[PDB]
Amino acid sequence: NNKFKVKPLPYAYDALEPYIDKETMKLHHDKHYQAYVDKLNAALEKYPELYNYSLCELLQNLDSLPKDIATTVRNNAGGAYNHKFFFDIMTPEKTIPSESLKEAIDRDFGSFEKFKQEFQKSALDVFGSGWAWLVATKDGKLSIMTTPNQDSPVSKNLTPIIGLDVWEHAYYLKYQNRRNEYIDNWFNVVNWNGALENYKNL
Amino acid sequence: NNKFKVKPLPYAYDALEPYIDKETMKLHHDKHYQAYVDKLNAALEKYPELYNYSLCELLQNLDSLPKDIATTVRNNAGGAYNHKFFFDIMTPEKTIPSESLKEAIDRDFGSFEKFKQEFQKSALDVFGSGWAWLVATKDGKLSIMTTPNQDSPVSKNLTPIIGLDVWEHAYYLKYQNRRNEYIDNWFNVVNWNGALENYKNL
Ligand SMILES: [Fe+3]
Ligand SMILES: [Fe+3]
Prior knowledge:
2 copies of one chain form a homodimer. Chain A has helices spanning 22-44, 55-60, 67-88, 99-109, 112-125, 172-175, 179-186, 192-200, and strands at 130-136, 142-148, 159-165. The first copy, chain A, is mostly helical and 202 residues long. Chain A has 2 domains: 21-91, Helix Hairpins (Orthogonal Bundle); 92-202, Iron/manganese superoxide dismutase, C-terminal domain (minor pseudopilin epsh fold), CATH 3.55.40. The first copy, chain A, is globular, with a radius of gyration of 17 Å. Chains A, B: Destroys radicals which are normally produced within the cells and which are toxic to biological systems. Chains A, B: Keywords: Capsid protein, Metal-binding, Oxidoreductase, Signal, Virion.
C-alpha cells in the first residue's frame, strides 16, 4: 500500500491551547486534512503509478499531469501537503529563531519584528481562503507571499519555511471574524526549530 | 450622505433558528457584511462620484473602473451586494415556488427536486470561499452557477434569483465542516416570494 496517508498530529490535540482550541485541532486534522488525503487517493485510483510520486512531485508537475485530474490533484495534494506542513510547523514547546534562519531573517527583513509585522499584514490581507508563507528561493533569499485556497509555493519552486492557514475553518470557532487575533496568537506556537530545518534543507 | 449602507436585517437575528444560529446571523450581518460596506466606502473616498453608482453598476463595470480601486471594489461591492441579497433571500415565513418562477424551474431543470439536487451539489463542490447561485439570462432561462470569493453573477450579466453563501463563516459555528447539512437545512428558509420578485424584475 503506497496510498497517501494522514500524518498523525505530532502533539496532543489540546497542546496548542489556549492559542488554538482542541476542537479546531480535531476538526482541522481529523476532518479537513483527512478529506484532502482521501480525495487525492480517490482521484489517483485511475493512475496508480502516481502513488509513487511524492506530494512535492505532484505539486511541481500540475501543468503536466493528465488534464482530467490535474485540478483535483492541485487542490487535494495541495491540501494534504499544506496541512502536514502546517501541523509540523507548530509546537507546544518554546522555540526561537537561530543559526542561519535567524541571520537570514535579519538580513532580508531588517529585523525579526519587521518580518513579523509584514507576515501578519500579509496573513490579514488574504481575501477568501488561503495561506500566508515565509518562503526561500533556492539560494536562501527569504520573502513573504500568499496563496489562494490550497495552492502552494512549492508549485512556484519556492520553499516554505513557515506558513499560516487563514481559511476560516482554521480560526472561526475561537476567533470568529477576528483573524487579526488568531494571527497574533499563532506566533506563540510557531516551531522555529522546524522552520530552521526547512531552511537548512535547501 | 450618499455613502453605501448596511441594510438592517429584515427579521430577528434568531428568526432563522434552528437552521442558522443567531450568533452566526449577528457576526455575518454585523461584522462581515458591515466590513464590506465600510471598506467599499473607504476606497471610494478617492472617487466620490462613485457613491452615485448603484452596487449593480459598480459590479457591471469592474473592468472600466480606475485600476487602483477596481479589485477593491470587486471584492467589497461584491461582498456588500451579495450579503444584502443573501439576507433578503431568506425568511422565517413559509414560502413555496409559484407563478412564472415555479414554471421556469420545471421547464429548465425538469422538476423542483432535480433543481434542488443540482443546486446542492454545486454548493457542495465550491472549493474555498464562494457562492452557489440560481441565475437567469435576460430572456428568463434558468441555470445554476458558482462564484469564488465575493464575485457575482451580476458581473457576467446574469440575474441572481437565489444564492447561498458557502464561505465557512456562514456555517462553521453550527455545522463545522459539515457543509452538506448546512446546505440541506438552508432550503427551509429560502424566501421563494423574494425569488419570484427577483425573477419578475427581468
Ligand atoms: Fe486548513
Ligand atoms: Fe458571507
